[PDB]
Design an enzyme around this catalytic site. Structure first.
Site, PDB file in Angstrom:
ATOM      1  N   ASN A 240     -22.533   4.527 -69.746  1.00 18.62           N
ATOM      2  CA  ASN A 240     -22.435   5.016 -71.129  1.00 18.62           C
ATOM      3  C   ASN A 240     -21.194   5.887 -71.254  1.00 18.62           C
ATOM      4  O   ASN A 240     -21.013   6.874 -70.516  1.00 18.62           O
ATOM      5  CB  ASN A 240     -23.679   5.787 -71.564  1.00 18.62           C
ATOM      6  CG  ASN A 240     -23.511   6.468 -72.937  1.00 18.62           C
ATOM      7  OD1 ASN A 240     -23.310   7.670 -72.999  1.00 18.62           O
ATOM      8  ND2 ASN A 240     -23.606   5.702 -74.017  1.00 18.62           N
TER       9      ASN A 240
ATOM     10  N   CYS B  33     -17.852   2.934 -77.691  1.00 19.50           N
ATOM     11  CA  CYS B  33     -18.490   2.096 -78.722  1.00 19.50           C
ATOM     12  C   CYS B  33     -18.864   0.672 -78.233  1.00 19.50           C
ATOM     13  O   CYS B  33     -19.841   0.507 -77.506  1.00 19.50           O
ATOM     14  CB  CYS B  33     -17.576   2.013 -79.948  1.00 19.50           C
ATOM     15  SG  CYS B  33     -17.362   3.567 -80.832  1.00 19.50           S
TER      16      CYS B  33
ATOM     17  N   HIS C 153     -25.944   2.556 -81.963  1.00 15.29           N
ATOM     18  CA  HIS C 153     -26.334   2.038 -80.664  1.00 15.29           C
ATOM     19  C   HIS C 153     -25.797   0.628 -80.365  1.00 15.29           C
ATOM     20  O   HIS C 153     -26.180  -0.363 -81.005  1.00 15.29           O
ATOM     21  CB  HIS C 153     -27.852   2.074 -80.516  1.00 15.29           C
ATOM     22  CG  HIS C 153     -28.309   1.906 -79.105  1.00 15.29           C
ATOM     23  ND1 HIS C 153     -29.570   1.457 -78.781  1.00 15.29           N
ATOM     24  CD2 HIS C 153     -27.657   2.098 -77.931  1.00 15.29           C
ATOM     25  CE1 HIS C 153     -29.681   1.400 -77.464  1.00 15.29           C
ATOM     26  NE2 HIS C 153     -28.539   1.797 -76.927  1.00 15.29           N
TER      27      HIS C 153
ATOM     28  N   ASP D  85     -27.876  -2.444 -71.990  1.00 11.48           N
ATOM     29  CA  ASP D  85     -27.834  -1.196 -72.747  1.00 11.48           C
ATOM     30  C   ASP D  85     -27.162  -0.157 -71.863  1.00 11.48           C
ATOM     31  O   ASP D  85     -27.837   0.671 -71.293  1.00 11.48           O
ATOM     32  CB  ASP D  85     -29.260  -0.799 -73.122  1.00 11.48           C
ATOM     33  CG  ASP D  85     -29.331   0.418 -74.071  1.00 11.48           C
ATOM     34  OD1 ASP D  85     -28.285   1.006 -74.437  1.00 11.48           O
ATOM     35  OD2 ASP D  85     -30.470   0.768 -74.434  1.00 11.48           O
TER      36      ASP D  85
HETATM   37  C1  LIG Z   1     -19.873   0.687 -87.890  1.00 10.09           C
HETATM   38  C2  LIG Z   1     -19.679  -0.270 -86.690  1.00 10.09           C
HETATM   39  C3  LIG Z   1     -18.204  -0.225 -86.265  1.00 10.09           C
HETATM   40  C4  LIG Z   1     -17.885  -1.160 -85.099  1.00 10.09           C
HETATM   41  O1  LIG Z   1     -18.194  -0.768 -83.994  1.00 10.09           O
HETATM   42  N1  LIG Z   1     -17.277  -2.407 -85.215  1.00 10.09           N
HETATM   43  C5  LIG Z   1     -16.543  -2.833 -86.427  1.00 10.09           C
HETATM   44  C6  LIG Z   1     -16.980  -4.222 -86.895  1.00 10.09           C
HETATM   45  C7  LIG Z   1     -16.857  -5.286 -85.773  1.00 10.09           C
HETATM   46  O2  LIG Z   1     -15.491  -5.284 -85.384  1.00 10.09           O
HETATM   47  C8  LIG Z   1     -17.260  -6.697 -86.278  1.00 10.09           C
HETATM   48  N2  LIG Z   1     -16.291  -7.077 -87.329  1.00 10.09           N
HETATM   49  C9  LIG Z   1     -15.046  -7.524 -86.939  1.00 10.09           C
HETATM   50  N3  LIG Z   1     -14.108  -7.825 -87.790  1.00 10.09           N
HETATM   51  C10 LIG Z   1     -14.333  -7.688 -89.243  1.00 10.09           C
HETATM   52  N4  LIG Z   1     -13.250  -7.982 -90.060  1.00 10.09           N
HETATM   53  C11 LIG Z   1     -13.094  -7.601 -91.480  1.00 10.09           C
HETATM   54  C12 LIG Z   1     -13.143  -6.063 -91.647  1.00 10.09           C
HETATM   55  N5  LIG Z   1     -12.283  -5.252 -90.766  1.00 10.09           N
HETATM   56  C13 LIG Z   1     -10.840  -5.394 -91.029  1.00 10.09           C
HETATM   57  C14 LIG Z   1     -10.229  -3.994 -90.865  1.00 10.09           C
HETATM   58  C15 LIG Z   1     -11.366  -3.129 -90.337  1.00 10.09           C
HETATM   59  C16 LIG Z   1     -12.598  -3.821 -90.898  1.00 10.09           C
HETATM   60  C17 LIG Z   1     -15.522  -7.216 -89.673  1.00 10.09           C
HETATM   61  C18 LIG Z   1     -16.556  -6.885 -88.680  1.00 10.09           C
HETATM   62  O3  LIG Z   1     -17.633  -6.464 -89.053  1.00 10.09           O
HETATM   63  C19 LIG Z   1     -17.685  -4.835 -84.561  1.00 10.09           C
HETATM   64  C20 LIG Z   1     -17.272  -3.421 -84.109  1.00 10.09           C
HETATM   65  C21 LIG Z   1     -20.150  -1.699 -86.978  1.00 10.09           C
HETATM   66  C22 LIG Z   1     -19.874  -2.384 -88.160  1.00 10.09           C
HETATM   67  C23 LIG Z   1     -20.331  -3.678 -88.365  1.00 10.09           C
HETATM   68  C24 LIG Z   1     -21.065  -4.314 -87.368  1.00 10.09           C
HETATM   69  C25 LIG Z   1     -21.347  -3.639 -86.193  1.00 10.09           C
HETATM   70  C26 LIG Z   1     -20.897  -2.345 -85.997  1.00 10.09           C
END
Ligand SMILES: C[C@H](CC(=O)N1CCC(O)(Cn2cnc(NCCN3CCCC3)cc2=O)CC1)c1ccccc1
Ligand SMILES: C[C@H](CC(=O)N1CCC(O)(Cn2cnc(NCCN3CCCC3)cc2=O)CC1)c1ccccc1
EC number: 3.4.19.12
Lengths: 337, 350
Positions: free
Chosen positions: A11, A16, A257, A274
């Site tokens: 961890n 993240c 998480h 995990d």
């Molecule tokens: C709040 C967390 C942040 C996170 O750890 N991450 C950001 C999103 C993640 O990268 C999956 N993902 C990947 N490319 C996306 N593209 C469109 C939007 N992005 C462009 C600029 C920043 C946002 C959209 C998206 O959803 C996974 C990691 C989260 C958000 C959504 C799902 C899981 C966790």
């Protein structure tokens, strides 16, 4: 690693989605084999991503203890929460796969990343009124799918290759041939052995000038047929894909998480990773339980393996695959450490 | 066809005798094949390099749907006539091949594959009975030559291999400054390698006809071969239990007889007969008992066993990823150059 045969990563509050992604990549055996085989003898152990990645992979395979990532995060300069907060998961994957891809160039294992992860697509414009196209080929290592309003993966691929009519107000400017009534779209030419799907849950919100996580229900199958999203299909090798890893997040922010579900051998024997704690789980726990719905828990990235490629992608990793130079360099580091 | 068994044959190109049999044997030593593909043959001459030539054979064996040729290979190690083959036991060719590639692997990620797979350790000794003297000679071996004359089976050959010989009477041991001494002479196995190459010594000098002749007496060998009892010290975690991988066979009385090899390449008891270009599925019984021997002159002269604890590492799967693109491009390049020599040679002649 007594119960599952698999060991955890420490961890790290600051990292993240990284632990989840590192496990996913480690269990892509052919990548791990390539990475072990990379010649890295004359590198800096702090600064080289290839060497750090070899260490993590090595330790993930051999350690009985939770494996650390600090030298890895150091090597690519993401040494704070903020780096992870400002990058989607696929951008980190690219940081990793790119470093090792270009270090494999001119080596015995050159071309492995693209053979595993690179598919091909064409962005096309097609004027229906006169025979002028604008077919534009393009390589991809991952696919970002829309889940907003989509029931499932199938519907996301439909949307992904949907036809936008360029008509009336927004006709296509053919420059020398003027405005033109056209259709805009994307077609898949190939889908790679290892298919990285990111589910676009994090979306910009005009109402708050911020990204917010969509927690909506979105279904993904264990078995995913994709022939219908290809331009021309292959009779001898249909694009039938097998679900290998589910990267999952609980909550609506970077403090939530992060775990990863995996069936590492491709046999439907699922484990939950995990951080340090790795445990056997049901398919239901790894699959339907992470469809999401209306702080809570869902998939944001899926890894599928092409079924005809499972034996190559998930080839057993043997002592042959780890050169003694590598075994000894990593021993010598622990010697001082 | 490769369509029947998943495995392709080697061309019958003159009398290379036991070569095709040995080539298939070594090819299905998967760990060896992977190491070979890894050898840096970057700027090797194709007519001279055995390593490169072998990479071509192994590559063509893995990918060709047609029978694979061996002429550049035979040319590379210089055995281009029947006499080259007649003047060498099968193990001598194997040594030539393994030594070449062992040497080419030096300073590479796959150095020490050959000894890891093939090298066992033994000691030959002479102990004086009456006096306190003992000569011990530690030696590596890559193969073992078993006596079959008057031996019922492998177990009996091994018994005879480590049997103590009394140096007494007229043939006393010369113990230097101890004078002649009653001694006893023997060989001990310290280790048995992961791949065990056993030659059965059917070819023996015959005083009366002043030639080597083939002995066709019955000689039995197990599918499962326990060898712990022939080790000086056994290992409780890793017993010397062996699995029959290949049976190299010969029919007839001389080097113009018929050579084939039986192999269950995966070590799973599912056997194929490799008869040059013709590979066919066969019974376990055709591979094993039907080559026991006992004019019936069809029988095994060489056996390959794999230690049971090592099977999955020795026979580890080979994929396209185990062949460097650089090697694949290089073997494509050679194919073009050889295609061009077909045209060039024909223009000079016509
Ligand atoms: C709040 C967390 C942040 C996170 O750890 N991450 C950001 C999103 C993640 O990268 C999956 N993902 C990947 N490319 C996306 N593209 C469109 C939007 N992005 C462009 C600029 C920043 C946002 C959209 C998206 O959803 C996974 C990691 C989260 C958000 C959504 C799902 C899981 C966790
Ligand atoms: C007539 C053929 C000839 C042949 O291709 N080979 C010669 C013998 C062979 O090398 C197996 N083998 C190997 N080392 C032996 N050592 C003692 C006798 N040799 C010492 C020098 C030459 C004879 C004895 C033996 O038998 C296999 C190939 C044959 C004879 C006996 C069995 C099978 C085929």
């Amino acid at each position: 690693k007594k119960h599952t045969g698999y060991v955890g990563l420490k961890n790290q509050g600051a990292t993240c989605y990284m632990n989840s992604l590192l496990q996913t990549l480690f269990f892509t055996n052919q990548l791990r084999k390539a990475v072990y085989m990379m010649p890295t003898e004359g590198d800096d152990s702090s600064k080289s991503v290839p060497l750090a990645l070899q260490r993590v992979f090595y330790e993930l395979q051999h350690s009985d203890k939770p494996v650390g990532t600090k030298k890895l995060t150091k090597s690519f300069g993401w040494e704070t929460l903020d780096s992870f907060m400002q990058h989607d998961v696929q951008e980190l994957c690219r940081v990793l796969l790119d470093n090792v891809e270009n270090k494999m160039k001119g080596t015995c294992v050159e071309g492995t990343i693209p053979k595993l992860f690179r598919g091909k697509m064409v962005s096309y414009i097609q004027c229906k009124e006169v025979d002028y196209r604008s077919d534009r080929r393009e390589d991809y290592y991952d696919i970002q799918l829309s889940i907003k309003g989509k029931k499932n993966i199938f519907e996301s691929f439909v949307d992904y290759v949907a036809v936008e009519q360029l008509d009336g107000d927004n006709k296509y400017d053919a420059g020398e041939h003027g405005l033109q009534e056209a259709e805009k779209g994307v077609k898949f030419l190939t889908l790679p052995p290892v298919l990285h799907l990111q589910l676009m849950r994090f979306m910009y919100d005009p109402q708050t000038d911020q990204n917010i996580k969509i927690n909506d229900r979105f279904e993904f199958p264990e078995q995913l047929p994709l022939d219908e999203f290809l331009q021309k299909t292959d009779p001898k090798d249909p694009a039938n894909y097998i679900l290998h890893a589910v990267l999952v997040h609980s909550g609506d922010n970077h403090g939530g998480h992060y775990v990863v579900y995996l069936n590492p051998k491709g046999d439907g024997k699922w484990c939950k990773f995990d951080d340090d704690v790795v445990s056997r789980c049901t398919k239901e726990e790894a699959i339907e339980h992470n469809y999401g719905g209306h702080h809570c828990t869902n998939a944001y990235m899926l890894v599928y393996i092409r079924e005809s490629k499972l034996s190559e992608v998930l080839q057993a990793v043997t002592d042959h695959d780890i050169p003694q130079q590598l075994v000894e360099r990593l021993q010598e580091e622990k010697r001082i450490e």
